[PDB]
Ligand SMILES: O=c1ccn(Cc2ccccc2)nc1-c1ccnn1-c1ccccc1
């Protein structure tokens with residue numbers, strides 16, 4: 001059978017949480033199939049259907065600075081690392097579902113927040129009043145799955161198919177960071193009181209949600225040079241949104257104001273402290289082998305503190 005193989009450095013480094021997929025766009029599909037074959041099996045998907053699905057998903061990501069095809073594959077790799085470090089915790093359908101959910105989680109992103117869509121009065125804001133872009137991303141995923149020769153789940157039973165699309169829907173919705181705060185609090189309480197039960201489906205859902213947030217935020221868990229350079233792409237989109245807010249006659253939050261570029265280092269600290277560190281802390285409590293994500297995140301926090309202190 002046709003197993004995908006990577007050069008030695010990638011073969012070894014792809015196993016590590018802090019792996020960067022590199023600047024060679026044309027290797028990213030092969031990298032994803034490699035991860036599916038090792039995470040799921042060579043039999044999970046028909047290679048011809050999977051390759052066709054991947055290339056349709058790629059085509060439906062836009063040429064935006066951050067919310068692009070590279071982000072999709074980067075988020076799928078973090079999930080690969082979590083699944084490979086927690087072999088026995090996840091079902092066959094979950095391993096299939098979650099890598100696909102990650103690849104598809106920002107399909108057709110325009111580089112704008114749900115907030116900006118609401119203030120613009122975008123049609124999608126009327127179709128989906130909450131988790132606006134996330135319901136769109138799930139919609140695009142179902143659209144692509146329904147293209148001729150793109151149904152990678154065709155060999156699942158009716159019930160297994162409904163289950164995997166339900167895993168994907170919940171996983172993609174959970175990437176709405178507005179939903180992350182409450183989800184982590186609940187997981188924090190369930191862990192502390194000892195009521196967390198991975199046989200409770202509503203509990204698994206919450207844990208998959210936190211994994212999605214962790215994979216989505218995984219830029220902050222890279223080596224400093226990757227984290228620092230990704231921050232430029234993230235802020236390029238924030239500043240364009242801020243520009244579009246000013247065009248609507250609305251002063252944007254400082255994070256999106258390119259006039260307030262001086263405030264970015266302190267804004268990063270807040271994000272690490274309010275979002276990233278709590279996310280990887282709770283994830284590490286629930287799934288101990290994901291500790292390297294927390295360790296790498298703490299290292300990047302310390303780098304941003306150094307930027308503030310003029311040490312860079
Ligand atoms: O660096 C960042 C700064 C701010 N925010 C958003 C935010 C800040 C404060 C309170 C709430 C929300 N996110 C990031 C970040 C790091 C990695 N990914 N993302 C990200 C996530 C979703 C969308 C776009 C980017």
Ligand SMILES: [Mg+2]
Nearest residue numbers: 105106175176
């Ligand atoms: Mg998103």
Ligand SMILES: [Zn+2]
Nearest residue numbers: 105106175216
């Ligand atoms: Zn994302």
